[PDB]
Amino acid sequence: MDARATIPEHIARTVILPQGYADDEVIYPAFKWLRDEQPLAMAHIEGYDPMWIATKHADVMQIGKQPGLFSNAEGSEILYDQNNEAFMRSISGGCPHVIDSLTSMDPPTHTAYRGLTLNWFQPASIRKLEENIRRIAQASVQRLLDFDGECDFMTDCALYYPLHVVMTALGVPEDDEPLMLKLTQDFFGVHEQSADEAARRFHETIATFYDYFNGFTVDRRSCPKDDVMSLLANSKLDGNYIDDKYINAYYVAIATAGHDTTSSSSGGAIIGLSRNPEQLALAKSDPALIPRLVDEAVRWTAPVKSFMRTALADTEVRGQNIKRGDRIMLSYPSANRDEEVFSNPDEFDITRFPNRHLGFGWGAHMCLGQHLAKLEMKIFFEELLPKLKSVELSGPPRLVATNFVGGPKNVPIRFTKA
Ligand code: HEM
Ligand SMILES: CC1=CC[C@@H](C(C)(C)O)CC1
Ligand SMILES: CC1=CC[C@@H](C(C)(C)O)CC1
């Protein structure tokens, strides 16, 4: 048990473990204490590696923008306990990355693979999806309106539109919805068999998904389209096609990254608006505010609770001596309530501007999908809000108990139709 750990065990447990993330009033006060008293310090709790907890907005940016010093590739970029990490390595040829996605990479590899789609995901390219996104948003709004004034905003509505959007961006047909839900909800969901058994199911299931995706790769090499599958399928590096393992990991990364985060942030927006009806009234009388509503939903929800980095050299941050090999947890939620940046950060306020939140991260790995996420949420709220006279919560929201991709999973609401 590492001599440098100074974070009290009860605080360290609260910020590291998955369970506390199910309650805002458990997690945020723990980060507040850290920001006030031990803004960048080391924690070591049973079953986890020792790790620095980056709680300050400044620090999360400084770390995120220096991938040559603070690595995604060297350790697990995801916060696993040791048993889970060991399992992951045992099914991944010793690597602490289950697939070859962008978040598993460091420059220059990372730069090359990110660069394959970087232009596609810029605003002017994404803007062309507007009409498709708007049709998809209207269908989800219609799903909600088919209820007689009562539903679960997540499971009856917000679960769907962001998956359809990622599907449209990839090129996956609408009829493959069941398969895509299995992908993001079952196979890569959080689950709140011996070891050899779970390993067998994993290898068999990922092969099934990769075989499915390969069919698209092949198809798009003969019949190109303006989708991401086609872009990746027809991409070359050093005069050759990209290996299937990178292509298929890219498809998976796009679907998994872009589904829950967007859905959860949408749920957060609904929670904010239900607790602050004056803001619903404002977004409805001034639709030009919706982009600020969207950014506030992402700040306040912060569905991505963490990513990890490993220090590749001895170095200094906020006066602390970070040593080669030390792991660091980046807390986007804590950065997003940093009092040095935001006033009254616990308040949901759609007028907040500027809104320099880290819900999409910062630096070399900053969310590839951010522009698509902002566009689709904007369009969704543009279509939903005129249709609602009022919305309120009918009971407590249920948040995912995870230290990774969390936020609202169930948001029971009542509403009146406009
Ligand atoms: C509100 C919705 C979303 C949130 C909060 C979110 C958040 C994040 C965050 C925090 C990261 C890590 C950034 C870092 O290390 O600095 C990330 C990476 C990524 N996100 Fe998003 N995301 C969202 C929507 C999407 C969408 C719609 C896509 C669709 C393509 C997407 C694709 C990605 C990819 C591919 C990466 C890895 C990029 C890399 O490693 O270079 N995300 N996202
Ligand atoms: C490896 C993996 C971890 C998280 C998954 C989730 C829950 C975000 O879909 C996506 C992919
Ligand atoms: C937000 C996000 C969740 C999953 C990551 C992974 C593990 C697919 O690279 C990509 C980015």
Side-chain angles (χ1 to χ4, degrees), residues 127-143:
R127 194 166 303 126
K128 295 162 164 144
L129 298 172
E130 170 171 11
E131 200 169 326
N132 281 12
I133 291 167
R134 193 168 308 275
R135 190 198 53 255
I136 286 164
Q138 291 172 339
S140 276
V141 170
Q142 190 57 55
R143 276 176 174 275

Side-chain angles (χ1 to χ4, degrees), residues 302-334:
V304 186
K305 307 303 178 186
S306 69
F307 270 105
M308 303 296 291
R309 302 289 194 267
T310 300
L312 298 183
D314 293 357
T315 194
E316 200 189 80
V317 179
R318 184 178 296 274
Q320 302 301 318
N321 298 126
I322 297 175
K323 284 171 75 223
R324 186 166 71 89
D326 283 350
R327 295 185 72 203
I328 306 159
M329 175 187 189
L330 306 183
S331 174
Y332 307 114
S334 188

Side-chain angles (χ1 to χ4, degrees), residues 42-76:
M42 178 159 282
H44 195 194
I45 67 169
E46 189 192 45
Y48 283 86
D49 293 335
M51 64 187 56
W52 294 95
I53 316 287
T55 71
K56 294 287 284 178
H57 183 278
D59 298 349
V60 173
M61 292 193 298
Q62 186 179 1
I63 293 160
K65 72 191 217 188
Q66 298 183 87
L69 185 49
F70 305 110
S71 178
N72 276 52
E74 177 56 22
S76 173

Side-chain angles (χ1 to χ4, degrees), residues 7-8 10-12 14-15 21 23-40 53-57 318 331-340 342-347:
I7 292 168
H10 64 283
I11 298 293
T14 300
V15 300
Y21 287 89
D23 190 347
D24 288 354
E25 296 192 290
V26 170
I27 184 72
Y28 283 113
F31 283 119
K32 184 167 187 305
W33 187 84
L34 285 172
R35 284 196 310 275
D36 295 340
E37 308 291 335
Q38 295 196 28
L40 184 66
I53 316 287
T55 71
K56 294 287 284 178
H57 183 278
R318 184 178 296 274
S331 174
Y332 307 114
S334 188
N336 283 1
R337 314 245 176 148
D338 188 333
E339 304 78 358
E340 260 190 286
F342 300 103
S343 35
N344 301 318
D346 295 336
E347 300 275 19

